[PDB]
Amino acid sequence: SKPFVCVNEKDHLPPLDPQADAWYREAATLAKPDTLRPWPRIVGLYSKAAERGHWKAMHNLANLYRTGWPGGVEKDTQKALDLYQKMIDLDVPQGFYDMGAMIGNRAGVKNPATDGLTFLDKAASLGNPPALTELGKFYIYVAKKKDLGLAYTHCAASQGYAPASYELGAYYKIVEHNFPKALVYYQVSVSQGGKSAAFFLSRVFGSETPPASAMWYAPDEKLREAYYSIYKKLEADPDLRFPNLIEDYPLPPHPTQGYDADRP
Secondary structure (H helix, E strand, O other): OOOOOOOOHHHOOOOOOHHHHHHHHHHHHHOOOOOOOOHHHHHHHHHHHHHOOOHHHHHHHHHHHHOOOOOOOOOOHHHHHHHHHHHHHOOOHHHHHHHHHHHOOHHHOOOHHHOOOOHHHHHHHOOOHHHHHHHHHHHHHHOOOHHHHHHHHHHHHHOOOHHHHHHHHHHHHHOOOOHHHHHHHHHHHHHOOOHHHHHHHHHHOOOOOOOOOOOOOOOOHHHHHHHHHHHHHHHHOOOOOOOOHHHHOOOOOOOOOOOOOOOO
16 A cells, blocks of 8 residues: 556557557558448457557457447457456556456456556556556545545656546646646646547637636637647547647636636
């Protein structure tokens, strides 16, 4: 029960195979457009990459099998589990996070690869941004361990993981009622590929949004569209980023709270 040191998930990853990553990136691209996609081919590429050890291909493919959302991909819980175990075999931090969502978090302590840790803790122990963000959500709100959660959520966003920066904005908006500091973190989330934050900032600066939901920020026509367009761009391609967003559009002041509710 000792808080984990913040480590980069990019420190405990296996080497990325070039041949396999090409299969993976073609499959990922084919999984996007307004066909309904060549699913037998998508599965072929993903699996081919997975057999060579590609860990994102294992993650993407298992997400197809774990659910059954693709029209041409069968739900196969066991195929997902076996892909999750291959990830763990390579000590891939995302592999622990994915397995705990399959067979239960507490099922991790039994697994020899966790070293007596639950799946979330083991993945967070390797700096996995999803695992640290989920623990942050349990610690901040469910448990009364707000400080541990914010720390873990801060570890996740420092690695560029947008949903953690989204939880930051949510925290400041909701727990601390610090709207301008919340807006700073929602924006950082957008610049990291945050879909939900781009939509949220669209409504923040939308005229049709009830002022309460907009944190009483004044509507802004250009800001409203600049964010909704980013939301549309990430909706077609979730892998894009926006490294100039912060500089290109500095956030407006707040009529009551300013640039940080703390120091207005």
